[PDB]
DNA sequence: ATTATGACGCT
DNA sequence: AGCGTCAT
């Protein structure tokens, strides 16, 4: 009872932009803006693949990792904004400039963990003990949570309706003599988030989505629970009942191999029937840290830090080359291994100038046709200058005798990924 | 021919 | 180090 931690202890968001790539070309050309849109990478193959998709076209059965022909299918009248092509590849400049508009308005309100291009943890634990003392214990106006779902309420017919009669129930119930109520940490930490929110919007044009909770996995999961454009706050006691139906590849982590084994092993569906295990049941299954987190994770209780940490620790160029387009020949590779280390050179400068580092290591990836994997072959070599023409002479040097083929002009097996990864910064 | 990334775990 | 997993 009294021992029994119950991970109430930090406040933590997730902020998540909508439709991301699709609203950065939405707001450069307002031609595209509310209507059915789609964001894909090269044409000549199928029409190119769909990397975005707006609500809209969402609405018509688009998804990602579509051929752009295909979701033409589905919806005639889609509208189609194509990533920038550079040196023969598909370059994201655009979409991790935006990202940086995002992530530094973010960073005023408190310090983030960037997650990924479009999406970021927020420890909000310090901000909102200082905004209830601000307070002084002043009740909590529904008119401060204006865009906030309560997960699992209202309980015992707009949409909006349903919204404002949850947010009714959560905030009537609400303790505000207790500075330490988790549930009123909490509610502030969704009042903050509002406004953080209202921020992005009003300075960059984008719209998110956002979860509050105690932890990253239940912030993450609460976010995605009504998208877009609206957050939802995951209380402690909101658990039992959410986890009860989740499926298990739901949360963050378990949506692979993991969390197939979860449920082939114990005979389970979904989170809440972890519970009935006991930890040390867990860890001889899934190991002695995953038993452990996933003991704690079913009861709503996780502990990995927001890391302070804004920008990427590595900085890549990838392209693949599928099907009859694989590279056969040594001047192909070595061509396309330029082309790839000309626009890490350009990214690599930028990140240099912007943000006092260097990096020190080049890691060299490919792949090979008839191959299992992402990676067939990952090799390194010392990064000394930020110079292109050295970078790719370096990764063919390292690369090298993956050619199995007498013929020293000739590649074989002909390569069906070539990746160039920038890694170990150091400051400068 | 589901591409371009990017973080972290295992041994 | 080099490979694997999982995520966006
Ligand atoms: N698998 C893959 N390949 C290439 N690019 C991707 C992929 N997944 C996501 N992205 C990009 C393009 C997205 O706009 C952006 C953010 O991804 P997410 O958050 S999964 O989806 P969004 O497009 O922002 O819609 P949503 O968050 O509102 O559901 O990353
Ligand atoms: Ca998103
Ligand atoms: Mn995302």
């Not at 009294?2 to 950065?24: I, N, Y």
């Amino acid at each position: 009872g009294p021992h029994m931690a119950t991970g109430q202890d930090r406040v933590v968001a997730l902020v998540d932009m909508d439709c991301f790539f699709v609203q950065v070309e939405q707001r450069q050309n307002p031609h595209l803006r509310n209507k059915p849109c789609a964001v894909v990478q090269y044409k000549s193959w199928k029409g190119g693949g769909i990397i975005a998709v707006s609500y809209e076209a969402r609405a018509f059965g688009v998804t990602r990792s579509m051929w752009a022909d295909d979701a033409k299918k589905l919806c005639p009248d889609l509208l189609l904004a194509q990533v920038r092509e550079s040196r023969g590849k598909a370059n994201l400049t655009k979409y991790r400039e935006a990202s940086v508009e995002v992530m530094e308005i973010m960073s005023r309100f408190a310090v983030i963990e960037r997650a990924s291009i479009d999406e970021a943890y927020v420890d909000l634990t310090s901000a909102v003990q200082e905004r209830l003392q601000k307070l002084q214990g002043q009740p909590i106006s529904a008119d401060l949570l204006p865009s906030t779902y309560i997960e699992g309420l209202p309980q015992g017919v707009q949409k909006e309706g349903m919204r404002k009669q949850g947010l009714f129930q959560w905030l009537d119930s609400l303790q505000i003599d207790n500075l330490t109520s988790p549930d009123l940490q909490l509610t502030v930490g969704a009042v903050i988030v509002e406004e953080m929110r209202a921020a992005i919007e009003r300075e960059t044009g984008f719209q998110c989505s956002a979860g509050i909770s105690h932890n990253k996995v239940l912030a993450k999961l609460a976010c995605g629970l009504n998208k877009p454009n609206r957050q939802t706050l995951v209380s402690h006691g909101s658990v039992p009942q959410l986890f009860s139906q989740m499926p298990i590849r739901k949360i963050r982590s378990l949506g692979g191999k993991l969390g197939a084994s979860v449920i082939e092993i114990l005979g389970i569906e979904y989170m809440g029937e972890l519970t009935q295990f006991t930890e040390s049941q867990l860890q001889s299954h899934f190991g002695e840290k995953n038993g452990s987190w996933l003991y704690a994770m079913c009861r709503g209780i996780e502990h990995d830090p927001v890391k302070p940490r804004q920008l990427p620790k590595t900085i890549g160029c990838s392209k693949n080359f599928p099907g009859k387009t694989a590279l056969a020949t040594r001047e192909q590779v070595q061509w396309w291994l330029l082309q790839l280390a000309q626009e890490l050179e350009e990214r690599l400068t930028k990140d240099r100038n912007d943000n006092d580092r260097v990096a020190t290591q080049l890691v060299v990836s490919i792949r090979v046709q008839g191959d299992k994997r992402l990676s067939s072959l990952r090799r390194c070599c010392a990064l000394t200058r930020y110079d292109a023409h050295k970078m790719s002479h370096d990764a063919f040097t390292v690369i090298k005798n993956c050619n199995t083929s007498g013929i020293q002009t000739e590649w074989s097996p002909p390569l069906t990924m070539l990746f160039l990864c920038a890694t170990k910064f150091s400051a400068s």
